[PDB]
């Protein structure tokens, strides 16, 4: 009846006020404001529990807040960022592109929140037993959803100076590795941080740099200063890598992915050091010997990478070691980690190299020449083929899946006349479980 006369039924009153560009209110902000605050909360109990375990106080005066942490924060942020993983990483680069702003500031919150986890897993492992999983877990989730590009161009100045001193961290802590294993091998603070190490910092590592690598977040990430951190990383790692001892044997095959993850991941040519200051991005340039009379720079570019060989070394003697075909324990370092260095090199160089841009050439900084890419690929085929049967191994399959990227280079049709050997071989020796192609 109100209808048939027009008498108009209104909504109850009229929006005094609407904040809907205010971030501040969001789900995803109130989300990580709690987040946050509880991962600082952990964090004073953790740091009160470092002087209380040494003392009288063994009983946790907080065994139901520390509980609820590590049983309840930790499940919920993995599951968050395995569902709404396109939602932070959309930053205005293209994916995501249906909708989706995590903003700024939720960017900004979501790396605020990795740095201080990372505080937080910080030589903790035995102390979160059991769950020091969920912790590298949620580091590998959180990494790979990180956002370095707005974090770089806007972000604050307290979380970038978080990430560069996780980093600066990470990096002491782990050279603090590699000078312990060097000075303690004959037969426990040490034993601690190997495993820390092992533990947390290379599948961390790995995860982090596979995903700039795929993100393109070097050109942007790594400029200042985070250049020299990653050159200590890099030469810290190889050497490791070149370290034989039986404490590293069995954590030789993390380190090999870990440190490709890292080749992907780095902006510089550190095999080509003789032709990096081809690179308008560089460091060397961008900052100059001025700064570094002032940086703790060795203010050389070979000498920031002595024990590290050149690329054309490095081609050099694994094609020696083509031709030789020696036998897997007699020298295990190159088959097992340098394989995978050049494979992640290369397949990131490759666009850099002269071939993609003609023009301009020669004042580049990757001469990979598609000669110089068959002879990659065509050596690591001969040292499968020579090394194939003398008791195979999974180490194997990753060197396949790793020169899956240098596959995509060469066309199959060009791939025969020298891929069918394999086949041949494949033919009378079928009598095999590892497939290849």
């Known amino acids: ?42 964090h004073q109990y953790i740091l009160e529990f470092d002087g209380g375990s040494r003392g009288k106080g063994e009983h946790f ?21 395995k569902n709404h993983r396109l939602y932070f990483l959309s930053a205005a680069s293209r994916p995501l ?7 700024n500031k939720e960017k900004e919150m979501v790396t605020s929140l990795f740095c201080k986890l990372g505080v937080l897993v910080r030589h903790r492992i035995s102390l979160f037993g059991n769950d020091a999983t969920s912790i590298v877990n949620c580091l590998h989730i959180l990494g790979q959803t990180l956002d370095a590009r ?10 970038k100076s978080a990430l560069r001193a996780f980093l600066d961290n990470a990096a002491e802590d782990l050279e603090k590795t590699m000078e312990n294993l060097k000075q303690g091998q004959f037969t426990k603070g040490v034993t601690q941080i190997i495993n820390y190490t092992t533990v947390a910092l290379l599948p961390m590592l790995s995860s982090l740099f596979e995903h700039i690598g795929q993100h393109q977040f070097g050109e942007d990430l790594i ?25 590293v044997e069995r954590q030789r095959s993390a380190l090999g992915e870990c440190l490709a993850a890292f080749a992907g991941a780095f902006p510089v040519a550190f095999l080509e050091t003789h032709l990096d200051k081809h690179n308008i991005y560089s460091i060397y340039n961008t900052k100059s ?11 050389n570019v070979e000498d920031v990478c002595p024990n590290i060989p050149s690329l054309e070394k490095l081609m050099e003697e694994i094609v020696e070691l083509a031709e030789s075909g020696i036998r ?73 899946v790793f020169s899956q990227p240098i596959i995509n280079k060469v066309k ?4 025969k006349t020298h891929f069918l050997p394999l086949m041949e071989k494949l033919k009378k020796k079928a009598a095999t479980v590892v497939s290849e192609e």
């Open 1 to 42: 009846f109100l209808q048939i006369n027009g008498y108009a039924v209104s909504r109850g009153f009229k929006d005094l006020e609407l904040d809907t560009p205010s971030i501040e209110k969001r789900f995803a902000y109130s989300f990580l404001q709690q987040l946050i605050r509880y991962v600082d909360e952990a």
């Open 223 to 247: 400029l200042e200063d985070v250049q020299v951190s990653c050159y200590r990383i890099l030469t810290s790692l190889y050497a490791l890598g070149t370290s034989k001892s039986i404490y």
């Open 412 to 415: 199959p049709q060009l791939l």
């Open 150 to 159: 707005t974090v770089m161009k806007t972000g604050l100045e307290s979380v």
């Open 97 to 103: 592109c249906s909708g989706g702003h995590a903003s």
């Open 328 to 400: 897997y324990t007699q020298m295990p370092h190159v088959m097992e980690v340098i394989l995978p260095m050049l494979c992640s090199y290369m397949s990131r160089w490759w666009e850099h190299g002269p071939e993609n841009n003609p023009e301009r050439a020669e004042m580049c900084c990757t001469a990979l020449n598609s000669e110089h890419m068959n002879t990659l690929l065509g050596n690591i085929l001969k040292i499968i083929y020579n090394n194939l049967g003398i008791d195979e191994g999974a180490w194997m399959k990753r060197l396949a």
């Open 61 to 81: 005066p907080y065994e139901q807040e520390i509980k609820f942490f590590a049983k309840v924060v930790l499940p919920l942020i993995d599951q968050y960022f």
């Open 289 to 299: 010997s001025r700064e570094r009379a002032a940086l703790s720079l060795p203010t």
